Design a protein around this ligand. Structure first.
Ligand code: HEM
Ligand code: HEM
Ligand SMILES: Cc1cc(N)nc(C[C@@H]2CNC[C@@H]2NCCNCCc2cccc(F)c2)c1
Ligand SMILES: Cc1cc(N)nc(C[C@@H]2CNC[C@@H]2NCCNCCc2cccc(F)c2)c1
Ligand SMILES: C[C@H](O)[C@H](O)[C@H]1CNc2nc(N)[nH]c(=O)c2N1
Ligand SMILES: C[C@H](O)[C@H](O)[C@H]1CNc2nc(N)[nH]c(=O)c2N1
Ligand SMILES: [Zn+2]
Lengths: 411, 407
């Protein structure tokens, strides 16, 4: 079976065969498409086949499929599963696995970079304090004084599911949110609930608009513990506009390191429930989503007021006007401070090249159009006109529910 | 069975039950999602007819009544004896309004029940098709106070007697390949424009040349017709602040009128069914003007605005884009020609979805198409989960006839 995808701007047609290697379900059926739905303990029985598929992939990629090394490794994993109901990855398999989970991440526009990924093996970690230290080192390494470097830190795998390592923060660096009694919110409304948990756990809240949250870390299924990231490690950028001098007076800033900490990395059947990873920002993540979502900092009106736009009718496109200026400001501010950032035009152009390379070398590239197309100026980016096929490959990153919903409190 | 859709901005959760009444295949499977692919007998006909008549009689609260059963027998008999059947006028109007209501890619469906239907099933020639189409254009345009309309020509028979409009829309601009290699006018219509000349259209060879109609009646070779210019309402494009904008020499037509789709009602196939409503501003300002394979005017507008065109990160493309779209909306509004902006259209669609969930049990919607091609996440549709599924009656895309036909 072959499937074709077309670019409607260029007429370049591509052929997908990689999707034949897919096993997991998308959420779609022959009768319903779920492409815009955000969210559409294992047995030996299921485990050895998952390990095998993975190691066959790995040995093919080093071009030792069917080698003595390959066969000895399968036998050795089989024996470890038999004896212990699980197994441990070699360092090389871990590195390969984490890189491929990124390569396979269909919602990620940044995947041209997939093979340059610094992997930090934290599988010897045992306590929350140890987690905190590994996470500090990740942040310092990744930040690299503004010359951002991609990285991931991988804590011990799931065992019985009663002993999970988790980072309770959804990203390593995020700002507190405080719901006021009048119903307004100070800071980031997305973090209100997490901020409340932090506070209950003992965090002393500065109660400002941009307070960096503490880390909340759970080792070995234990109750999570609070740590403050040293401020000298948190790189931040004050937001100003190249032409509008009143922009700085809005008091906006943002952190330089986007570092997703709430996902589950699955490799050869093993589940890494704490695997924080980081890259660098595409500008629209901050300037469109974080600043301009109604449910977030919501600065559109205030910026439009200062621009003296006609705010009486939507058809003045005052929201669209303010939006571009804010995104100009974010790119200008990061660039002037020499902090790595990518605009949506450049990032999408690179993804198209990545995607075409992947069809040629790999036989495909799973991609989720709904997520890949930027949240402003969609159709003036090349990805808008690119047909894409979405399917699920492993190794993979997966969403997990927030731990406060699942955690058994020990006290 | 029951499926939920969440709005991530408002937290509102809706339950879909309408999808269980779905019949056609989406293109997706459990292993692969094809949500972004643009194109993913007597025995066959009676269940189709029955499925349709059951829903029709249910809608007028006469399900299982004598009139219902009688009609189902009359349609059975007609199929058994003729190999097809004929819709009552009431059924035709119901079917058309519902094909629009079921159109998952259409953001403007809040309007679905206000559709003027022109029954052209008595038409026999291309000259007659031209008359029907002229009347549709004049009725729909209404001197700028646009009204939604569809004109329905005779249904498919044995297949070699199809009625077809060859144009993809009733009103579009010519495209010509030029001596230097570049393109004059609309590059999307270069192929169609050459066929017009091939069949003998004397092309004025300008930028905004309204194309002639090419009409295929009863399976015959198509014929050329120029729409009376006085029936084609056009809008000169100016900017409310930029004096220089008028000087780019831009105009667009007021009436968007899709003419290449197939209407399917109760298993009957209406291959020529041009319909029209009114524009959302981004269709013109983002897609027609700014697509690279289209009029591609971003480069020139950014120049007039003396923006920094050195780096993509200056967002010069984005700044120009907004101003262009301000201009489209301004020109239409100043000339009293119906238009809707993307903010207003998407707000209305959310309101429609919620009406449809509560009144019908769902609303099929294709997020990829409903989200505007600019400013996506500042419109409410961006944050709205949608379920896409295929209900009949429906509109379906059909391939260009100049591949199918033999002269
Ligand atoms: C190197 C710079 C990178 C850029 C510019 C980039 C860009 C993006 C963007 C724009 C998204 C959509 C995210 C959103 O809108 O919330 C995304 C999603 C995602 N990225 Fe990348 N990314 C980068 C690096 C990485 C790395 C290093 C990994 C892991 C090794 C990764 C894995 C993922 C995953 C798993 C998602 C889906 C997130 C979710 O479901 O919430 N990305 N990326
Ligand atoms: C009254 C105002 C209307 C508005 C604002 C509107 C808006 C839109 C928009 C923005 C699209 C996306 C298609 C594109 O971007 O090319 C669309 C598609 C569509 N519309 Fe509506 N529409 C209106 C009336 C109608 C009517 C009267 C019908 C049929 C009776 C209709 C049926 C469809 C269909 C079948 C599509 C998908 C087209 C395709 O596959 O190329 N629309 N509409
Ligand atoms: C419900 C749900 C499901 C899901 N899969 N996900 C979410 C997080 C949402 C996705 N969209 C906004 C928020 N995500 C927040 C930040 N995502 C940054 C991705 C990124 C960028 C650059 C470098 C990197 F390493 C990583 C929620
Ligand atoms: C390949 C293919 C498939 C398909 N289904 N379709 C197409 C036409 C493309 C889609 N999108 C841009 C262009 N269609 C151009 C304009 N479509 C107008 C929709 C509309 C608006 C207001 C009132 C109406 F009555 C109708 C191509
Ligand atoms: C409902 C819809 O799927 C949801 O709003 C999605 C749309 N596209 C997205 N795309 C990205 N990159 N990030 C997101 O959070 C979303 N949200
Ligand atoms: C490849 C992709 O499906 C294609 O470019 C789509 C994207 N969304 C669209 N949305 C609308 N309304 N109209 C279109 O023509 C398209 N084109
Ligand atoms: Zn799908």
């Amino acid at each position: 079976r072959f499937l074709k995808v077309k670019n409607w701007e260029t007429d370049v047609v591509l052929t997908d065969t990689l999707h034949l290697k897919s096993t997991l379900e998308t959420g779609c059926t022959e009768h319903i498409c779920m492409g815009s739905i955000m969210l559409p303990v294992a047995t030996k029985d299921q485990l050895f086949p998952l390990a095998k598929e993975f190691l066959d992939q790995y040995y093919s990629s080093i071009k030792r499929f069917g080698s003595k090394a390959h066969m000895d490794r399968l036998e050795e994993v089989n024996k470890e599963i038999e004896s212990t109901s699980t197994y441990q990855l070699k360092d090389t398999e871990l590195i390969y696995g984490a890189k491929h989970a990124w390569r396979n991440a269909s919602r990620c526009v940044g995947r041209i970079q997939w093979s340059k990924l610094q992997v930090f093996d934290a599988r010897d970690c045992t306590t929350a304090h140890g987690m905190f230290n590994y996470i500090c080192n990740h942040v310092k390494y990744a930040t690299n004084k503004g010359n951002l470097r991609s990285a991931i830190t991988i804590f011990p795998q799931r065992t019985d599911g009663k002993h999970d390592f988790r980072v309770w923060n959804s990203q390593l660096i995020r700002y507190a949110g405080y719901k006021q009694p009048d119903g307004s919110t100070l800071g980031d409304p997305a973090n209100v609930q997490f901020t409340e948990i932090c506070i209950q756990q003992g965090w002393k809240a500065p109660r400002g608009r941009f307070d960096v949250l503490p880390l909340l870390l759970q080792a070995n299924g234990n109750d999570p513990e609070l740590f403050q990231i040293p401020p000298e490690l948190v790189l931040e950028v004050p937001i100003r506009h190249p032409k509008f001098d009143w922009f700085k007076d809005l008091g906006l800033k943002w952190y330089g390191l986007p570092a997703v900490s709430n996902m589950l990395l699955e490799i050869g059947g093993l589940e890494f429930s704490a695997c924080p990873f980081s890259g660098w920002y595409m500008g629209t993540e901050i300037g469109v989503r974080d600043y301009c979502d109604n449910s977030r900092y919501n600065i559109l009106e205030e910026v439009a007021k200062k621009m003296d736009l006609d705010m009486r009718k939507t058809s003045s496109l005052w929201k669209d006007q303010a939006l571009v200026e804010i995104n100009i400001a974010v790119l200008y501010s990061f660039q002037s401070d020499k902090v790595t950032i990518v605009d949506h035009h450049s990032a999408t152009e690179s993804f198209i090249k990545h995607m075409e390379n992947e069809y040629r070398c790999r036989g495909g590239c799973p991609a989720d159009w709904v997520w890949i197309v930027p949240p402003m100026s969609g159709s003036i980016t090349p990805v808008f006109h690119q047909e894409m096929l979405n399917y699920r490959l492993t190794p993979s990153f997966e969403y997990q529910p927030d731990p406060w919903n699942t955690h058994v409190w020990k006290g």
